[PDB]
Paper text:
[name] (X-linked inhibitor of apoptosis) directly inhibits the upstream caspase-9 and the downstream caspase-3 and caspase-7, and therefore controls critical apoptotic checkpoints. The [name] protein consists of several domains, including three zinc-containing [name] (baculovirus IAP repeat) domains (BIR1, [name] and BIR3) and a C-terminal RING domain. The linker region blocks the active sites of these caspases, while the N-terminal regions of the partially processed caspase-3 and caspase-7 bind the [name] domain in a peptide-binding groove that accommodates the four N-­terminal residues. As has been reported previously for other [name] domains, the overall architecture of the [name] domain is a three-stranded antiparallel β-sheet surrounded by five α-helices, with a structurally important zinc residue coordinated by Cys200, Cys203, His220 and Cys227.
Therefore, the structures of [name] [name] with five different peptides soaked in and bound to the Smac binding groove were also solved: ATAA, AVPI, [name], AIAV and AMRV. Replacing the N-terminal alanine with a serine causes a loss of activity for both [name] and BIR3, although this is a conservative change. The crystal structures of BIRC1 and BIRC3 and [name] [name]–caspase-3 all have an N-terminal serine at the P1 position; the Oγ H atom is within hydrogen-bonding distance of the glutamine at the edge of the pocket. Even with a serine at P1, the P1–P3 residues bind nearly identically. However, the P4 isoleucine is much larger than alanine, and even though Gln197 rotates away from the pocket (in fact, Gln197 has two alternate conformations in this structure), the larger pocket created by this movement is still not large enough to accommodate the isoleucine side chain without a shift in the backbone. The position of [name] in [name] aligns well with most published [name] domain–AVPI structures. The additional hydroxyl introduced by the serine substitution results in only a small shift in the side chains of His223 and Leu207 to allow the extra atom. Next, AIAV binds identically to [name], but with an intermediate position observed for Gln197, which does not have to move as much to accommodate the valine as it does for the isoleucine. This series of structures highlights the flexibility of the protein and the value of having multiple structures for comparison.
Numbering used by the authors:
A (entry chain A): 151 to 233
B (entry chain B): 1 to 4
Write the structure that this text describes.
Amino acid sequence: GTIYPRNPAMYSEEARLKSFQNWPDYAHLTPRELASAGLYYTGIGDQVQCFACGGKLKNWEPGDRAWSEHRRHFPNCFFVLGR
Amino acid sequence: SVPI
Ligand SMILES: [Zn+2]
């Protein structure tokens, strides 16, 4: 293909959801919302990564939404642009 | 949030 995901295994939303098993208790966004936006947990802090573009986000703040943060920071991601 |  002409595009290729940074993490093919995390292609699956269910695989992304499972990655949040040890998502920290202070991290306010839900695994549901994050996984739906393409994001999976890297295992460090509140840091997540997109399976598609490979961008990483951390230090979530109140009012942040997963999709709007993903699109603001990585607007050329194919998952963002395929939504 | 911020990018890494
Ligand atoms: Zn992305």
